[PDB]
Structures are given as C-alpha cells and as structure tokens.
C-alpha cells in the first residue's frame, strides 16, 4: 500500500519578522534529493460538499533542492553521566547499589545501570534477563563473567539490589531484598513474599574501559562517536538512589543499604540523588546532582518522570515539594521522546512585508508530499490588524501523533462508529520510534504520557490529515475559520498559545477583538490570567469552540518546546498514580481548571457539559434571542429558523463537544442564553465532573445537561464575550456556499466587535 518516504519538523512553532526558523528532514534511505517550497494554508478539508483544499505558493530563499538522508532518533528516557577519564570504571574491587520498581520485568533484556560497550562486551552492567537481575563484567575479548539471581522479580514491587566485584576472592556477588511497605508497591504486607537472595559466581575476566558514558535505565550500544553514546535495551519502571562504591561490600552493608543508610560514605565513587533540586517551584531541570562530592553530575534524556513516589513513600504527604526525601525516584519508559535531535537541513528568516498567517514548508520526494506547518507573527511589539487569531499549539501538542483507535479499547465506543484511518495512522503504528506518543496514549507500562514535544514529526498537524472521530481535528479544523475570514475580506493577525504564555495580556491588548481556535482545551495558568485581565479592561473575545480551558498545562522553563500535563478523574484518557498529581515543572497542583475554582464559565461564560462523535445536532432559538438588547446578533435571521442544520463536521453546528450556561460555576449574572442544541443520541454522555452517583440514562436526549448554549455578556470599558459552545460550529461556516445562519451570526458579532463603538451593554 501507499507508505511514507519523507518526514520532518521545525525547532519552534512561531516566528516574527527578522527571526530564523530551522527545519529537520529524514528519508527512509539516503538516496537522491527532495524539493522544498513555502505555502500559505487557507482550507485543509477536502470534503466534496465544501470549498475543498486551498493554499498559496510564496516565493522565498527556502525554495530549491536538498539531499535526502536517513536521520536516526534516540527513543526512550534514561540518565547519561559523561565520564571522559573513566573515573566510574574502577580497576579493583567495586559495588553498585540501587532501589528498582519494574513495570515489565519479563519484556526481554533491560539494562538497569551500566558503563558497558555491547559491541565489544566490555565494562560492567546490571540488567534484567529472563525476568532476573544479572550483574555482568567483560574485558572486551568477547568473554564475560555474570552472576544471576535465583528469585525472579515481581511486577511493580520495590527491591534493594547490590552487585559486588571482589578480585581478592575472585568473585561476583548479588544481594536482592524486597522493601515493600503499605503504600509503595502493587500488593501490601499481607502477601507472604519470599524474593530475598544472596548469590555468588566465579569472576574469570576483569572489567575493561567501555569508552562509553555511564547510563541509568539502558546499555551503551558501542564506543562513543563525536561524544554521543547511543542507549539500547531500555528499562521500564522506577530507579531510586543509584550509587557506586570503590570497595567490595558484605551482607551487613547490603542489609544497612536496604534500610536507606549511606554506608562507608568516604568509599563512594558516585551517588546520584534524583530528589536534589526540589524546591517551592518544583524541579524544572534535567541536571542530576552527584551527592558523593566528586562532580560526576548526570543529565536526564527524553524527559523521564521527575517528582515520582520513591521506595520509602508512606503516603503521609502527597506533594513532592513538601516531602522531597520520599520522592527520590525517576520513572523511565522505553517509548519516551522530547527531541529527535536531527541535523538541520535548511533555515528561513522572515522578510519584511510577509503578512502574519498560517504557513507550511511543502516537500516533494519520490511520489510522497509532506508539510511542515508553522506560524508567522507580526513585527515584535506591534499589531498589523484589528483581529487576532490564537492558534491552539498546546492542544496541537496534546493530540500530537494520537493513536487512540490503535491502542484504546473504548476509542470506537467514544467515537460512536467504525473509525476511518489513512496512511499517516498506519505509518504511526508501523514506526513508533520516529514519531512518539500523544497525551491521549499510555506508555507500554500502562501509565499515561505526561510530556509532549514540538521537535518531532507530528503527522496529525498537516492540513490534509483526517482524524479517527469521523472528520478533521485541531489545526485543519482551525483552517475552517481562516478560510472563512479570507472569504469575507477580514484583516487578522496570528499568534500561538506559547506566544500568549510568554507575552501575557499585553499581546491581547493590541487588538480590538481576539478569536479562539476550534478546541482550546489545553491552557496555562498565565493564559487564563491574561484572558481574564484582557476581558476585564474592555477586551472583546469570540469563543467559537467547546471544552476550552479544561486541562492546566505548564511549559518546561529549560525546554520551551516541551509541555507537561498530569490528568485525573473527569473527561480523561488516564488517571495519575497516587501521590504524583503535582507538576515537576512548577511544583503546583494542575489537572482540571474546574477543580482549582477556575471553571471556563468564570472567563468565557460556558463550560464543558458533554461529548459524542456519531454526528452533530442543530440550535433552537431561546426567548433571549427575541430581546431588543441582542437584535444586532440575530439581525437577518428569521426568529423561527434552525441554526446550523448541515455542516462539514457531523452535518450540524451543535456537536462533537458541547458547553453550557452555569451560574454556580461562575457564569456572569448578566449573561444571556440565545439558543440551545438538540438531536443528540445515546452516544453523547454526561461528563464525570457533573455526576455524584451514576444512574441509567445519563446521556443525549435523556438528561438536561447534554446541550450547547449560545451566550453573550458585556464587561467594563466597552468589552464583551460571545460563545457558541460547539467544536463543529466552524464546520458549518461555509455550508450552502457561505449562505447560512451560522455565517450570518458570526459575521454580525465580528462586525460589531471591530467597530470604534463600545460593545452593546447586557
């Protein structure tokens, strides 16, 4: 079948005038060249019932031919300790101690901690083989000496592990002890577990210099080339307080180490404390501190989960910023990715005069066509239009390389029909290592993905992609708005949620009106503050979406291209494990905006009420539609008409996800309810946030909460907010060749908001 030959990404999502953006491209094999050009995206949807695909070719220095080459990606999270002088390769007796918590103990060979060359079989390693802990040394001749535990590891049970090399006794020794407590392991103290052992083997070789860096949760593939050690045999689960001793430890030393005592402190060569660096602002760093005072500092790679519950976590404190001594563990997954770390293929500097809009680099190679989307900002500190459009880049990262229909059992049940997938989904399933996972997917362990990166090829970001829920999703869906604006001759600027996070209310204050995307689901605390401050001081906003400001996210201070989210009970793909709710990036309780007394109703007037993807309904006008105060909104619409019956997203304006009016959740008292959506089937469900005790019939057409509400309210200094409360709204703008109630209503609101007059008082 049709397979993908070329893929690529960019270093940053948005760029302003005179600023540079870099592009990274990988082919299946190194052969021939590919063509690169610049295009402006207008309409992504290729539905025959609609306008169809639209782009504009733009002349640039970027246009031309570049050589096509394969670029390898390091996949899976680990810790790397650079050791140029082979300090962590002792010449005599030595020992290695750590706490381990294995999630997939029987999933092949997994390196726990190593200074190891797998090509030459040189150095030392502690790994899991056939579900048993093995301590191995090698001299580089191919000959190796190993000691193997006689007690196979239990899944998600905390263990204390000690490996010892004793040349005086010519011996390898291994000590294993279960350190289960009430709250730290899969099962409790009632289980009569017998997994303790002390085993000995003959050492016939000596540990040679591997010429690699020391690794936690991996093995060195070969000798480091240009100072890079490729990591293989990736470990799944938690490691806590790994240390190396320059002597041979006994049974009593292993017993004291298992209880958390730091034995023979002078004899330590290295001791990595993963909790070192936790403060009131969390631990926003990849720096791992060497606590032995020999400066063998480590680096986290592919963002392992920091602020993870440790071996001694008794559950008295559930915030890692208040009990750092019980949060000394790192969680490693074999399928983590924070950066592809490819070589640059070409760069682009934004010239003067290039209008702020949605842009892409179009690449042709063999019969394959690929797009690398990005956003051009206006010149720094200025606006070039009265309208601002906010691209939902945080939401784009949240759904980046989503594989719900291939992984989640309930994907089709939520969708309410058999999913339709394209070559992009097949490509994601075939080669996971190239692309990584979404925040809607779980790791191979089962824990939900908490970190997402911009610096990777994101297939569902391209304008021509069609999503599993039966139509287009995220960026393509946002193009429904862009095309509409371009059709009506409106002048607008473009900004990303990242740019809003950086610039605050000052970015919004430069425009008369701000327009949200199709699905601004993921926002930062700062973004909510900026929106609130903008609307309070006379700003005007149009919420042409549903399920906005649902999840709290934080942008990594050291890596602006990395995004963190930790999810809980509600409209979620997964739940955070006990005691791991607080974000490592800022140390704050995240999850649902509603749970932190900042429900969407408090800012935009309506909040998440229901979801369902079988099809879309239509709006019926409510009494407030007949009010004299909102005659401007409903001008040219007959008071006995349906609003948005027909569209490119489920064939209606009210569908996919819905928002409702609610005073108790912070809807402004002066807010008017203009229309409500109807014709929702059993597929549409009441969200878990609105349930005390689940009972039968809490679904579309059987519960009052399953609806969308069109609302408007006014603020101080001539400001106002208008909400349609539906994802599929933008899907109905171009219906019947731009002749419909949805287009008329949106045009009326936008025309009123761009005038020099204050927004009408309600």
């Amino acid at each position: 079948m049709k397979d993908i030959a070329i893929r690529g990404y960019c270093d940053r999502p948005s760029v302003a005038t005179g600023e540079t953006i870099r592009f990274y491209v990988s082919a299946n094999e190194t052969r021939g060249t590919f063509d690169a050009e610049l295009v402006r995206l207008i309409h992504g949807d290729s539905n025959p019932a609609g306008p169809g695909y639209k782009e504009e070719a733009i002349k640039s220095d970027l246009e031309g031919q570049y050589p096509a080459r394969f670029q390898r990606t390091q996949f899976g999270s680990y810790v790397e300790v650079a050791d140029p002088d082979a300090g962590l390769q002792p010449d005599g007796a030595f020992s290695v101690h750590l706490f381990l918590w294995s999630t997939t103990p029987s999933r092949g060979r997994q390196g726990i901690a190593s200074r190891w060359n797998d090509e030459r079989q040189s150095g030392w390693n502690l790994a899991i083989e056939d579900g048993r802990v093995v301590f191995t040394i090698g001299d580089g001749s191919g000959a190796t000496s190993s000691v193997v535990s006689d007690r196979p590891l239990f899944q998600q049970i905390w263990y204390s592990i000690t490996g010892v090399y004793d040349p005086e006794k010519k011996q390898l020794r291994l000590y294993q002890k279960s350190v289960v407590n009430r709250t730290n392991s899969r099962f409790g103290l009632v289980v009569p577990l017998d997994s303790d052992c002390a085993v000995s083997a003959d050492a016939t070789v000596k540990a040679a210099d591997s010429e690699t860096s020391l690794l936690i949760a991996g093995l060195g593939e070969a000798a480091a080339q240009d100072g890079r050690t490729w990591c293989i045999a990736h470990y799944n689960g938690k490691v806590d307080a790994p240390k190396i001793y320059g002597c041979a430890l006994g049974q009593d030393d292993a017993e004291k180490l298992s209880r958390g005592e730091i034995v023979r402190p002078i004899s330590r060569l290295a001791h990595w404390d993963f909790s070192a660096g936790i403060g009131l602002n969390g631990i926003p760093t990849d720096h791992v501190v060497d606590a032995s005072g020999y400066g063998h500092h480590g680096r986290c790679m592919n963002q392992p989960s920091r602020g993870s519950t440790g071996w001694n976590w008794d559950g008295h404190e559930e915030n890692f910023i208040h009990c750092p001594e019980q949060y000394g563990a790192l969680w490693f997954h074999e399928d983590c990715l924070d950066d592809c770390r490819w070589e640059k293929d070409f760069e682009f500097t934004v010239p003067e005069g290039l209008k702020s809009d949605f842009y892409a680099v179009k690449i042709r190679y063999e019969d394959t066509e690929d797009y690398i989307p990005f956003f051009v900002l206006p010149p720094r500190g200025t606006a070039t239009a009265p309208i601002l459009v906010i691209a939902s880049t945080l939401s784009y990262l949240a759904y980046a390389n989503e594989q719900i229909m291939h992984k989640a059992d309930i994907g089709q049940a939520v969708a309410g029909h058999t999913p339709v997938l394209n070559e992009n989904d097949v490509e994601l399933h075939k080669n996971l290592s190239y692309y990584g996972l979404s925040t809607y997917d779980g790791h191979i362990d089962g824990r939900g993905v908490q970190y997402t990166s911009w610096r990777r090829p994101i297939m569902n970001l391209r304008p021509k992609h069609r999503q599993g829920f039966g139509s287009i999703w995220e960026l393509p869906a946002d193009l429904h708005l862009i095309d509409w604006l371009n059709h009506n001759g409106f002048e607008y600027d473009v900004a990303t949620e990242h740019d809003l996070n950086d610039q605050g209310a000052e970015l919004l204050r430069r425009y008369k009106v701000v327009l949200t995307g199709s699905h601004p689901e993921y926002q930062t605390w700062a973004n909510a503050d900026a929106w609130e401050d903008y609307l309070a001081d006379g700003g005007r906003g149009m919420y042409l979406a549903a399920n906005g400001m649902y999840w709290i996210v934080e942008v990594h201070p050291e890596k602006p291209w990395v995004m963190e989210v930790r999810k809980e009970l509600g409209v979620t793909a997964w739940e955070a494990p006990p005691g791991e709710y607080h974000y490592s990036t800022n140390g704050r309780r995240g999850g649902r905006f509603r749970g932190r007394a900042r429900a969407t109703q408090k800012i935009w007037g309506t909040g998440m009420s229901s979801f369902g993807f079988d099809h879309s309904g239509y709006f019926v006008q409510m009494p407030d539609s007949q009010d004299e105060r909102v005659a401007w909104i409903m001008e040219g619409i007959d008071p006995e008409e349906r609003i948005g019956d027909g569209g490119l997203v489920g064939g209606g304006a009210g569908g996919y996800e819905l928002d409702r009016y609610d005073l108790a959740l912070g809807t402004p008292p002066n807010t008017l309810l203009l229309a409500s959506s109807v014709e929702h089937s059993v597929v549409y469900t009441v969200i878990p946030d609105d349930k005390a005790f689940p009972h039968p019939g809490m679904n579309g057409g059987e519960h009052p909460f399953v609806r969308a509400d069109i609302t408007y309210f006014s603020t101080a200094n001539g400001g106002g907010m208008f909400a349609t409360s539906s994802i599929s709204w933008l899907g109905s703008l171009s219906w019947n060749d731009y002749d419909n109630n949805v287009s008329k209503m949106t045009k009326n609101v936008l025309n009123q908001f761009i005038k020099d007059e204050p927004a009408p008082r309600v």
Partner: protein, 125 residues
C-alpha cells in the same frame, strides 16, 4: 504458604472474561435472530443521522465497539472519497490485513464491517 516464583501465578479474572464473552455472543445472535430488521436499519443510516439507532441495534453496537483492539476491524481509506477497504489491527511494527473488496463510500464500508462481525460471531458459534 510461600510466594517466590511469579511464573506460578496468572490473571485468574481471564476465567471470568471467557465465561462472560461466550454468554454475550449467545445473547447478540439471539437479538439479530429475534429483531432481523435492525440489520436493514443499519444499512439505511449507519451514523444514525436524524434517525437514532434502535435500542436492540444500540445493544449490538455496545457489544461490538468495546472489544480488544488486537484483531479488531477498522476502515482504511485507499483513495479519499473514492476507495475504502476493511483492515485488521495487528502487533506494533506490522502492516494491517486489508480486504480484497473496495467500497465507494465510508457508510457502505461501515455496513460491510457490521455484517462481517456478525458472520464472525456466527462462525465462532
């Protein structure tokens, strides 16, 4: 009493999952036998667009839609708005098993998937 070897234990709830699944299959075949019209209903409007599925059809959908992903059917779009095929989900790093027959519309493909699943449940029993 001693727990030493993880290989001496398994997910015993599997014993329920088998016992449950068999009963459910026997139930589904009964529904399609006692309410044959639902099949034709699904042919008319698989999305339930302005004509919501019957409770019995919804019961059959509820059984079919929550099955394990490994071995489950989906629709592969060979050509946009032109050709669709029935694909089977396999292990990571494997291509899907595509059907030989082509379908002009996604609705036709969904109805074909529905019929194929009913035939599979019949074949098992």
């Amino acid at each position: 009493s001693c727990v030493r070897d993880p290989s001496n234990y398994r997910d015993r709830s599997a014993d329920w999952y088998a016992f449950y699944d068999e009963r459910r299959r026997k139930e589904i075949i009964d529904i399609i036998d006692e309410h044959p019209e639902i099949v034709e209903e699904h042919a008319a409007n698989p999305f339930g667009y302005r004509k919501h599925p019957s409770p019995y059809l919804q019961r059959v959908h509820n059984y079919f839609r929550m099955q394990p992903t490994f071995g489950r059917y989906y629709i592969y779009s060979e050509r946009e708005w032109d050709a669709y095929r029935i694909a089977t989900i396999r292990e990571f790093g494997e291509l899907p098993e595509l059907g030989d027959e082509r379908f002009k519309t996604e609705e036709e493909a969904m109805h074909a998937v529905f019929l194929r699943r009913i035939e599979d449940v019949r074949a098992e029993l």
